[PDB]
């Protein structure tokens, strides 16, 4: 017991003011430290549910408090007025060796001991569960199995791929009350747009983790080499997206009002918007059926606001070196662009090509990528009947006509830029040159790498490549390509 | 015997790449661990990491691994880098001898020690000091085996370093002499002379002005120096490699300044301890300045080669990968190698220095040895995390 | 499980909810017995009836002279029971050297017959599961793509072509088909 | 004479960071740094009295 | 995804109902038969499994599951030859060989009914209201 | 063969048996 515990009560509380000012600090200059043109988070409101807002909604003053004690204590210690060697502490002694003294050591060991131990194993055990995409390992297991004991036999259908996500074992957690028996109607009634029972609370959760669960069965799939398979869940995605199943005209039921039976009836050859857009601007809201100028102007609005692709200069790339080599690691290169069925068939001449290709600072020449991350992210969706507000996303994927399987992980892309959109360049329309800005069409360019390197021989080797679209039923691409070895 | 059977507590192996999260969250655990291990009483002590239940800390494994590192570099055992039971059998010695250390040094311990047998509790003690220093053992297994960083050890150090620098700085231990309390936290201090006493501008700038212990002075020097070293961090001389085998594999080879990794500190502290303790058992601030500098100079100069590390030897690794230097001529590599690693090299080692005795002049708050040790340590785990992707 | 006919020694279990391994061994083991039955021979051979397979050749030579006679539709009546009792009366371990050989004598046949006679839905079917075994063939992918856009649908049809043309772009007739679609895709957009 | 010169037009080609990239190293680094310090400093404090008082 | 569970249904059936000893005979043909051609799927899909696990979006748990399911069935199928040869002297040596022949004939007979589902699906969705002729 | 769990859970058992025994025996000299 070499050491004192000042009693005293004179010399700790400095101690755990400054101990705790340090901390406070910090905090205080923080706080009082105090690109896209995004077009449906002003509007979507106009077409959401009133119970989907109170489900989206419904599912720094410790600073002040401890600068509050600064004053007690220092007003504290001011008040209080105040050969030769010591091994003095601050805390009072009263806590070293009173009748707290048991208390403070259970306590501690109860800290460490328990509290430690148990919320480590806990936070692991919760950690080591899941996959390394957000998805549980039971649900993962459920999905291969399904796939490998899946003889492709069948076809796939939305149906189908819905009795697979009844099996969200993570669903089955939250909702321990109900079977996937169930689940399954409830999608659909929900795909229909038809409502549930009492479980509209329900349903919302359910396809809100439902997106992620299908990123992660497309992963499964495709790195299992079902290309079908995968090019279903994509269009299943779009369909639980906009609340619709999947039809040969639903293109336009992707609208926000339509008068659908009437519709329907009246008119089925119309499944493309440049159709829409082909008509009259009276004659399109006639052929519709809401004779509303608000609703009309809505609709031409949104619709104007849907993506849609076009290739331009799809090809191959090695970075550094400029052509194809056996046993060689390329990677797709395709500078596109964004229409919406209101500026169509723009010559690749007309581009003065400059501005296209990609520059040689040689960094970069080894790293890509960095040009295209530069770009914006894609802005937010529109989906009503998705209870979140969602940016949009793209996907691209490869395909082999060797086999037609799949043969890597499928790629995400979501940063992009629609500026090529905005009423601002209106005045291109269908119905050619004069006053256009030739240099303010971004072109979008999109470079995905390739997993398995080229091959070791030479040849003109056949693949095909097909973007699509989630969230829209839009004009999404599909083409092909090859790449011609040389040595 | 080269080979053996394995009756010994081994480590799992990561079962997958594991991700940056769960590392670090694994590093603070193990390092709690040796924390609450490094400042917990023993049983058996009547008397005055000193006396603490790891006083003999990690030197078991120290001692293996610098041991079979000596050995190899003399390459005693003729190892073979082909299969996986090589680096088993490597482990298996390592762990082995460790265990025999063990034993030993605490028996050792025992006897040493003026603790007399009175008589089994001294055998309950000394089991208790097994187990501590297998747990470490099994612990910085882990750690290095995958689910850590890298080189718990190196980690230790830096902890023990910096938790001694801010113990230093703001623990609450005080001394009373003439003046009342002095605490030798250095903000403690420094806070309570501004709250006590009038003459603000007079005792800001006479603590400030304290000739006998730690200043705001001073650990502003340390937080200076601090920020620059880290800043002389980075400073990477890039250059462009092209493969040839795997065509189209682009890359950049990186060389740090530090390309020895502050060895040359060690070297000459190593040297003056060899020295002057020896000398004295049995103005020249220019001599002992430029002393450092030439220390450094050829202590990098050697370091660089026989740790392995050539011109020559970076060459005919290169000759292995079938790396080109893009932008130059296939041979001209070593001639330019043989102009770059030597001139970096000898320099880091002047900057190291200048760094060095900087901080000795400046008195702050620690060794800049340990500083710079610490702090390649951490940047080290920080380009992990970058290179491949952190949260 | 088992509900089933002793007479004709024939098993079969419950008539209730039932799983498709279920069905599928039923089935199974039903068609081994009959071919334990009709062999007779404890020793096997890995050899078929020539005279059977003879008996099929004969039916399809009616069947060609039934196309002699200029009749479409009894010709693919005559070749689809030759489909049928082939796929029937050969054990699972017949010879594989005539299996598969004749069994796309057959399926071509077929699809022309069919495609000229003027049904094509189940054509587009016979196509895919023939593609689903493997035959990749140019005229394969003539029949697909021409009963693809006969049937009014365009990517799949993109999609398909394609894959045909990654294998020989130097002939004309899928081109002219990839212009077809070419402008029909354009229409349909416009 | 010839050395620091030499050495000195060879290191201004060794392309340093700059301000933003400094920013984010020390930010990680010395903030990993600070955390383990703290850990150890606040663990050994706290456990002083402990050290007394189980004896 | 079983039926091994089926054919010890049927062979503790036989052991009292007695139907016929080709019917076992039969049934053991189905159970050998589906036993080769999974352990021919698993060892084709061995390397693609492999590779998702690599890439880490499964777990420990399904690939610890896959590894027994492999052990298993390399040692039920050895009990199968056992059972065979105990059943019969000279039933093992032609015996796999038409064991993957029926296989691939049992495959194909799949496939070949498939186009019933695959026909009533794609009519299903696409509404084509095929004519009794050519339409 | 141990898991990380394992390892950490076996160390702080002994270390919480140390410290037990410890203030354990403190008692047995002073209460008992």
Partial sequence: ?487 | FKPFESFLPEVIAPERKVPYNQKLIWTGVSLLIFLILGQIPLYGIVSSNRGTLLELGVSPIITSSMIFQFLQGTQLLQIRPESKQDRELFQIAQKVCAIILILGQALVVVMTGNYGAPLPICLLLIFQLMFASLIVMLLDELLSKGYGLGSGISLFTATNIAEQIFWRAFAPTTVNSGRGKEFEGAVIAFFHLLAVRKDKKRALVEAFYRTNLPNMFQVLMTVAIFLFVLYLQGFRYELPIRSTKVRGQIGIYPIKLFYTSNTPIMLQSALTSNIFLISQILIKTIVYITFVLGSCAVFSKTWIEISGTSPRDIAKQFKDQGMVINGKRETSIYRELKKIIPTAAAFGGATIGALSVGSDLLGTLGSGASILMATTTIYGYYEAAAKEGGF | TLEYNANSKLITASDAVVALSTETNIDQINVLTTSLIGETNPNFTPQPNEALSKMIKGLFESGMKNLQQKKLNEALKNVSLAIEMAQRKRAPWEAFAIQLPELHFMLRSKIDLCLILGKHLEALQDLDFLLGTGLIQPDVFVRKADCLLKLRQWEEARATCERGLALAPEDMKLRALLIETARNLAEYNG | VEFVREGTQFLAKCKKPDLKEYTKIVKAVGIGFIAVGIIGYAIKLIHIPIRYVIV | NDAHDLYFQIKEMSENEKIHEKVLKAALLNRGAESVRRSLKLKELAPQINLLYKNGSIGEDYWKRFETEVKLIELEFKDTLQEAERLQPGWVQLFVMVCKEICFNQALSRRYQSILKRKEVCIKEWELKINNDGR | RVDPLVVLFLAVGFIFSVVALHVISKVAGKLF
Wanted: aromatic content about 10%.
């Fill in chain 1, 1 to 487: 017991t070499n050491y004192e515990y000042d009693e005293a009560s004179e010399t700790w509380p400095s101690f755990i003011l400054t101990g705790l000012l340090m901390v406070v600090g910090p905090m205080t200059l923080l706080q009082i430290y105090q690109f896209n043109e995004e077009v449906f988070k002003n509007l979507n409101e106009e077409y959401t549910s009133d119970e989907i807002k109170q489900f989206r909604r419904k599912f720094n003053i410790i600073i002040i408090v401890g600068w509050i004690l600064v004053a007690i204590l220092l007003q504290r210690i001011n008040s209080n007025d105040a050969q030769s060697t010591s091994h003095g502490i601050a805390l009072p002694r009263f806590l070293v060796d009173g009748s707290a003294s048991p208390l403070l050591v259970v306590c501690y060991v109860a800290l460490l001991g328990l509290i430690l131990p148990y919320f480590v194993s806990r936070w692991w055990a919760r950690t080591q569960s899941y996959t390394k995409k957000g998805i549980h390992n039971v649900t993962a297991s459920n999905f291969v199995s399904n796939l490998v004991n899946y003889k492709p036999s069948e076809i796939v259908t939305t149906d189908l791929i819905l009795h697979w996500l009844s099996f969200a074992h993570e669903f089955k957690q939250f909702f321990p009350d109900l079977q996937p028996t169930d689940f399954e109607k409830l999608l659909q009634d929900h795909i229909n747009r038809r409502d549930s029972g009492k479980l509209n609370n329900a349903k919302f959760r359910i396809v809100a983790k439902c997106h992620s669960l299908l990123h992660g069965l497309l992963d499964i799939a495709c790195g299992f080499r079902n290309l079908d398979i995968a090019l279903g869940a994509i269009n299943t995605f779009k369909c639980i997206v906009q609340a619709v199943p999947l039809t040969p005209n639903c293109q336009i039921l992707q609208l926000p009002n339509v008068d659908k039976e009437h519709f329907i009836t009246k008119t089925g050859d119309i499944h493309t918007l440049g159709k829409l857009f082909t008509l009259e601007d009276a004659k399109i809201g006639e052929v519709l059926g809401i004779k509303d100028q608000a609703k009309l102007n809505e609709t031409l609005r949104v619709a104007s606001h849907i993506p849609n692709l076009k290739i331009i200069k799809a090809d191959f790339l090695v970075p550094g070196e400029n052509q194809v080599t056996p046993s060689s690691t390329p990677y797709i290169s395709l500078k596109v662009l964004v229409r919406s069925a209101k500026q169509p068939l723009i010559p690749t001449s007309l581009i003065p090509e400059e501005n296209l290709t990609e520059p040689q600072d040689f960094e970069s020449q080894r790293d890509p990528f960095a040009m295209m991350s530069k770009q914006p992210l894609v802005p937010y969706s529109f989906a009503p009947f998705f209870p979140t507000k969602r940016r949009g996303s793209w996907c691209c994927l490869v395909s082999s006509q060797k086999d037609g399987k799949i043969l890597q992980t499928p790629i995400i892309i979501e940063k992009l830029s629609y500026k090529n959109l905005n009423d601002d360049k209106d005045f291109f329309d269908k119905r050619k040159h004069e006053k256009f800005d030739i240099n303010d069409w971004e072109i979008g360019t999109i470079k995905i790498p390739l997993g398995q390197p080229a091959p070791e021989t030479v040849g003109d080797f056949f693949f095909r490549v097909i973007v699509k679209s989630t969230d829209y039923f839009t004009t999404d691409l599909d083409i092909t390509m090859n790449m011609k070895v040389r040595d």
